[PDB]
């Protein structure tokens, strides 16, 4: 489905897609690193 | 009778001094109020300057002190023994021309006045320039100091007012001469502007691992400060940058002038007042500062005298000045030419030309948005 | 090598008991240390540099301990550029050489044993989950480094595990009764405030405020150490229940403090002695002219950044901020006096009142009527005990805290 | 604005080496570059060293140049002499304001 | 590339010379730079200032109020109008523009003109 969606999109407005998969597999919360007390993105969200 | 003392650098400047005070004395009533100035020279050694300094202005009683830049190339060593021996107690010290962001926290030093614009209104007229371009992508580098971090701060909170972001913000490092993975990072992206505030030396080496990357030309304009232009920086540099300077920077009689009549006038408007007691004389045997101390500095910041050699020398809540002027000058095949005039909030260029570093005549746009993406997607049953 | 120096105006500890056995207890073989004291007159800047320029002029070597008690909070930038003109290491520990400073040179060696503004923000909040009341304000005047503190507490509340409510974040600096200050300081309707003030500026606007009503019985001010003063002089507008985080000056002092400088002044001289095997004297002549621009012989900060005695750890950061400071926690009572509430130990807060007893405000203030005490069991579902997380340690969302 | 001071005239024995001064008496010619022109007897001047480093192409590898950094002037030296030299030696330097050239000097066989 | 300059051989005292060098091999609309070379006889080189076909010039300080240069993309010529000349103006006037480069450097250099006022 997406990726249909994406060729329409790059039909109708021009670039030059390069997908590619997300390393850890996680959608992305937030979550408190380890050894500290902070805040700081992870998985796929982290990668934007 | 009062005397007002200061610290000079030659003695052709004592001899200005006593004439634009013989000049003011000559004005204004002059009733039961005398000021006789004293002056002194520089020293190398900081420990005996200072010493020297109290033990002869400390021991006269004076109500102010004046402190300039000695002649030697360089460095910013004048004001820092004066201002702490004087930051003892509360008289007020007036600068020169000492153009430094360090003498700007009030917490260091709790009393130091100025008549000359410190290196944060470069950054206020950096966006008041580009108010009028529309550009709006800035992206800055900024030397790990504390000269470069203040302008940071300076620039953040600006745009911050007009819902901005700009693009990212490098860090580089002093005193180095190896410099690639900053301007290698920085070559991606879609901002055409390389704002840069070094110190001195760093220009040089910025400007050829610059050059060296083949970014001048065809776009990527440059924008600099006062000090990135002067002397051993200029030498290696490309045309185009838009090398804006001060006027009326290296002068200091009008600047003599100019402070010892707002001096004058902040006495004059003190004098009337409650009973006024004298600071203590011999830098030894007092350690207490005198009552009112605090207030001559804040009757000193809403004195305003705008008539004695420019426009409106106005004391802000910090004390470095308001209502400067400066002169937008641009670098075109050496020997720099004036190209516009700034006088807050309403730059007026001129009418001569404009050559932007790569030989065109349009103003370039900076944006190229590289038209690709790098999409990114995640393992799905039904969708992907 | 190293000094002493001390000031005598207000302390009696003199002669020679504050001046004999440093660090020779039984230590392994750190030096063959001597002590050589000192008693200087009221402090004043050329008897200050000529008793630094001629002690110079001898032993030297690791520098002084210099401790005073003058009030002024203009000699620490002095001394930080004497060292930073003459390089030897020098210490503070008492009166002047505390106001702690956050600008300074780079090649600076001048380190304070005092608490800096970044961990009073720490404290402040510690001591005010403690007790559960969250939701507050943060009404701050103009002073150099609010801005900073201001943007640490943001920092501190936003990555935080409990969440806090903050409303009405009022920075009001036109006069003090014009219109725009009274509206900002009417907007405020939570009760707990903090403010970060100058000594008289807060004076000011806590007298201003107690007409218009902010400081009745259900009301808890809270202020950093720069307003807590001497701990000695109190003006007559400071309502009791005035907790503000204080550095200690009751527990320990003098003795105790001499000689953990002394010891670590030792410790990073036997550091350096480990690698580098040599302590040379850096000073040349107390005046004289074109001398040499810095020695880098010797570079104490990397060596003395990681250094403990007697057991406690005593390091340094990368500023002159000591890592374990030993600050407390102070409130004015019924009396005018500062009490001895909490004692911030090594990260807990380890406090001595379990419930706030509920101060009274002032000398004409309405009694209490709205607070009372309630009496349950725990049975049936009516009502049912838990006990809280051991991370986040309170109750999370709705539950009321019973003791 | 300066002056460029230059000896009036110089001769030696051919084939050795002759080396020129070139003085510049205000600021100090350290950081902005100089040139070193050659012209013919009633022909236009012709470039000879650049850059202080670099030799235009087909230049004789005799020329060389070099900057003193401690008495503020810049030399010029030749070797190997020879009749064909005869000219006269021009240096060129360009300041924050205008430009400026050399007096010039003269050499004999 | 070649440079010809010819001028219009009239030297009479107090006078105005307007000289133009064609350039054979080149293109006067470029990004380089154009300047005019003096040569009083048997004295040293000055310069008197340089052009460009994208705008501001600059002459020099000592006549700026006396000298004025512009040039034509068209007919690809740059003339001179140095007005109010003294009869003390002779000299030698010769056209090398410039190298693009990183500084100015002369090259090549035109085989000039001879004006004796």
Redesign the interface.
Known sequence: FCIDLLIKLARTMNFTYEVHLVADGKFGTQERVNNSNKKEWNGMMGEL | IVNIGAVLSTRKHEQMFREAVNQANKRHGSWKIQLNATSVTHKPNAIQMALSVCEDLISSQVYAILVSHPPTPNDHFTPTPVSYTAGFYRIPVLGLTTRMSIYSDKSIHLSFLRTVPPYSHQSSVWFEMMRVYSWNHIILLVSDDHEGRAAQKRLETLLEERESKAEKVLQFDPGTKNVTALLMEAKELEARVIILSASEDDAATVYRAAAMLNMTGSGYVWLVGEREISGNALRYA?DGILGLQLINGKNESAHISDAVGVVAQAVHELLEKENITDPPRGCVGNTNIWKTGPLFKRVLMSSKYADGVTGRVEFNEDGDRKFANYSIMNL????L?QVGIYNGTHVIPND??I?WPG?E?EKPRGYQMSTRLKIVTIHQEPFV | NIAVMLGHSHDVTERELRTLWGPEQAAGLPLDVNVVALLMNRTDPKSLITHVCDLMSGARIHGLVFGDDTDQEAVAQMLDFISSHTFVPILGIHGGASMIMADKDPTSTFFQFGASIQQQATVMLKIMQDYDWHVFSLVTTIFPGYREFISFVKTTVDNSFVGWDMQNVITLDTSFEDAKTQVQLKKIHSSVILLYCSKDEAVLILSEARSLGLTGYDFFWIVPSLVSGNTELIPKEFPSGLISVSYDDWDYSLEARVRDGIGILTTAASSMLEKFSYIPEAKASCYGQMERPEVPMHTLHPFMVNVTWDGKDLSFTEEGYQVHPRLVVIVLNKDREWEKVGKWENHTLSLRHAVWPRYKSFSDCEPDDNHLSIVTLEEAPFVIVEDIDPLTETCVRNTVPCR | ?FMLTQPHSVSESPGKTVTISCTRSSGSIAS??V?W?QQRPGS????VI??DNQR?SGVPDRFSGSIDSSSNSASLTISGLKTEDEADY?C?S?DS????????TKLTV | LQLQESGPGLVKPSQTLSLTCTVSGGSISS?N?WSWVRQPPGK????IG?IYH???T?Y??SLKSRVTVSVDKSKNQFSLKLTSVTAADTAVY?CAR?VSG???????????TLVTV
Do not use: C, H, M
């Not at chain 2, 075109?332 to 020997?335: A, N, V």
């Not at chain 4, 304001?97 to 010039?104: A, D, H, I, L, R």
């Not at chain 5, 040293?44 to 310069?47: C, F, T, Y």
């Open positions: 490309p075109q095949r050496r020997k030419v001569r030309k050559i030989g005549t | 604005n902005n570059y040139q022109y236009a001047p012709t470039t650049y850059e235009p021009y060129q360009y304001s205008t430009v400026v050239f050399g007096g010039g | 990004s730079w040293g080189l000055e310069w340089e994208s705008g501001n600059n020099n300080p010769y410039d990183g500084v100015n450097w002369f090259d090549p250099w035109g085989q000039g």
